Design a protein around this ligand. Structure first.
Ligand code: QS8
Ligand code: QS8
Ligand code: CL
Lengths: 243, 242
């Protein structure tokens, strides 16, 4: 089959009194796997996973020159300590620094953002709402399977932006690497509009294959945020993708 | 500019080993070593030569990109991971000599010689076979010369395309987590005394980069793990990694 439902993965959610979906895509076999085919195709606010396309657009338009360019703290002190400092594209991604990406979005502006998301075939392509918040409380919606379609294009340098912009964002997505695998990914937490959900989207690079992944889960409180990565890794371990 | 810290000798002594670690603090423009003399002694690069080889092969279009497949020739060699297909990422990870021998042949002596001059790489001498000179030929490079070369690569200042430099830095990816990223290449000079192990690269932190280059005497393959282990003991002592 091209898509396979594996309800056995539901145990990794229920074991934590959680609900959500993991979607995997085996690039060599062109085969997908999920615990929940319906939720795999349900569209949600992307929240901080939108830093991938936002970074790409900012780079391709020269809003961001390169991964070294420094974005000065605005002096407004905020809840998350790591945000109250200067950043570059690498640290802004790592610490998911909202204010930096709000400024990128304002400099990209409404018209270029809407055109680029259409060029990317990104989710419902709807940027209705505030130009500097629509991915957290506007009209944009993307499903786990749509996140995978977008990430496969980025992985292959097939998005309609320069190869250089694609290579810089994939560098900035680096999360973990050892002698067994490389993960390039981005977390999100949709907190403003119900339902509150966590995201983790990206891919696992092996020696001879790539496994794309997109997961979301109900996230009523920040208490469960570590389960985004932990449930994903339980599934990757079950499927013998990582040791 | 250069500070000798003989207190690091304990990390070699403790493992009944001899060698040099060179660190470079990019933000402060300050270098540190256990041994100024050995830091400036030139050795065969062995598999550390895969960095400049990769760069030249990408810049000339001998390698199209990091996905291009180099087919196994069906000849069983001693290192099991070599006996299969590779791309640039796995060829570097497993240090696959046959792949790089073929790159060196397609590049040719003339283009190889000019590019190592452009890189100011070691003694820029490619005497010996086009496809072994880094293991038993004329090319030699010191730990301090590795750092100069790596700093250029890190900044995209080598005389090759930006694209070539980014692709090789991707191929050098060795380890990453929430505290650091290491981009590096191992080597083992086995043919001509002194038999040594290399580990060269850098540690990316949020707010700085620490370049490193280490070699150590390696009389048998037993000690190869010490290249990374001793380097990490020094990085942990200097509070660079936890
Ligand atoms: C993004 O989804 N953000 C920014 C910040 N943290 O994001 S992340 O899940 O840690 O990557 C707070 C949640 C939301 F506003
Ligand atoms: C290069 O140094 N090589 C190739 C191979 N392994 O190299 S490495 O130390 O693992 O990078 C065997 C020794 C030497 F010929
Ligand atoms: Cl990378």
């Amino acid at each position: 089959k091209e898509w396979q439902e594996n309800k056995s993965w539901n145990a990794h959610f229920t074991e934590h009194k959680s609900q959500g979906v993991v979607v995997l895509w085996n690039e060599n076999k062109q085969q997908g796997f999920t615990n929940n085919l319906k939720r795999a195709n349900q569209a949600f606010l992307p929240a901080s996973t939108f830093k991938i396309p936002n970074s790409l657009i900012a780079l391709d338009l020269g809003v961001v020159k390169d991964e070294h360019q420094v974005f000065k703290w605005d002096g407004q002190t905020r809840d998350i300590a790591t945000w109250n400092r200067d950043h570059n594209l690498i640290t802004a991604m790592k610490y998911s620094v909202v204010p930096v990406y709000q400024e990128f979005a304002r400099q990209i502006g409404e018209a270029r953002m809407s055109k680029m998301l259409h060029a990317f075939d990104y989710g419902n392509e709807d940027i209705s709402g505030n130009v500097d918040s629509f991915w957290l409380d506007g009209g944009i919606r993307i499903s786990a399977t749509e996140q995978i379609s977008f990430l496969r294009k980025l992985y292959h340098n097939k998005l309609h932006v320069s190869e250089r912009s694609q290579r810089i964002v994939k560098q900035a997505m680096l999360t973990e690497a050892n002698g067994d695998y490389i993960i390039r990914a981005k977390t999100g937490y949709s907190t403003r509009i119900e339902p509150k959900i966590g995201w983790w989207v990206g891919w696992v690079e092996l020696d001879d294959n790539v496994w794309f992944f997109a997961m979301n889960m109900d996230m009523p409180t920040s208490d469960g945020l570590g389960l985004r990565q932990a449930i994903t890794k339980e599934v990757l371990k079950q499927e013998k993708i990582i040791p």
